[PDB]
Design a protein around this ligand. Structure first.
Ligand SMILES: [Mg+2]
Ligand SMILES: [Mg+2]
Ligand SMILES: [Mg+2]
Lengths: 129, 88
């Protein structure tokens, strides 16, 4: 019935030393995975403030099982900053995903938590490479 | 100038998980979709760093398959011969 609804799992992937060294820039990547329906809003937060500069988020989520009709989905985003900005241990980076799922009204008898509308986040702190 | 590279980025909460970031390639490069349904590859995304008047292209690839590496992630695409693949 409603058991095909799943919230996202979210993870932040830290910039590689190779990129920092070669380009003096640092790209963070956020992945939201395993969600259905494909209705999410992803945003980046740096030191508690939402950022839009240096961000690119996929225009469309991708199906993880493109043959399936109600396949779960994934979405990626990148935030690129200067190498010095990433390497500053005072900078806190957060990828936020708002998921639009079930309400409190909805019945639920599955063993997993009720996939309600919610925000799932992942984080990384800046550091020397 | 372009500086095409495929970088490996590690998960901030579990170092054994990673993604592969193909980045800084010129706009004539076509990133192809994956042929294996267990390997995920995003479309090219254009990212603008206004603070530095700088634009760059990227695509992201990941998989749970044990044979997936940053070296083979973008194999389905025609990419530059001078693409940099750092040893991890
Ligand atoms: Mg915060
Ligand atoms: Mg290769
Ligand atoms: Mg190739």
């Amino acid at each position: 019935d409603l058991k095909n609804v799943f919230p996202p799992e979210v993870a932040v992937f830290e910039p590689s030393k190779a990129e920092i060294s070669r380009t003096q820039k640092a790209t963070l990547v956020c992945l939201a995975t395993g969600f259905y329906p494909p209705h999410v809003e992803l945003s980046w937060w740096v030191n508690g403030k939402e950022v839009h500069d240096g961000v690119c988020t996929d225009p469309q989520p991708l199906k993880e099982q493109p043959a399936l009709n109600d396949s779960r989905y994934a979405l990626s985003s990148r935030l690129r900053v200067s190498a010095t900005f990433w390497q500053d241990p005072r900078n806190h980076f957060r990828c936020q995903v708002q998921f639009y799922g079930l309400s409190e009204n909805d019945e639920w008898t599955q063993d997993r938590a009720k996939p309600v509308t919610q925000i799932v986040s992942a984080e990384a702190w800046g550091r020397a490479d | 100038n372009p500086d095409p590279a495929v970088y490996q980025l590690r998960d901030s909460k579990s170092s054994d998980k990673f993604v592969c970031l193909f980045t800084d390639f010129d706009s004539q490069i076509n990133v192809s979709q994956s042929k294996d349904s267990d390997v995920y590859i995003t479309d090219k995304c254009v990212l603008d760093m206004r603070s530095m008047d700088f634009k760059s292209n990227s695509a992201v690839a990941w998989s749970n398959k044990s044979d997936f590496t940053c070296a083979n992630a973008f194999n389905n695409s025609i990419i530059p011969e001078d693409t940099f693949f750092p040893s991890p």
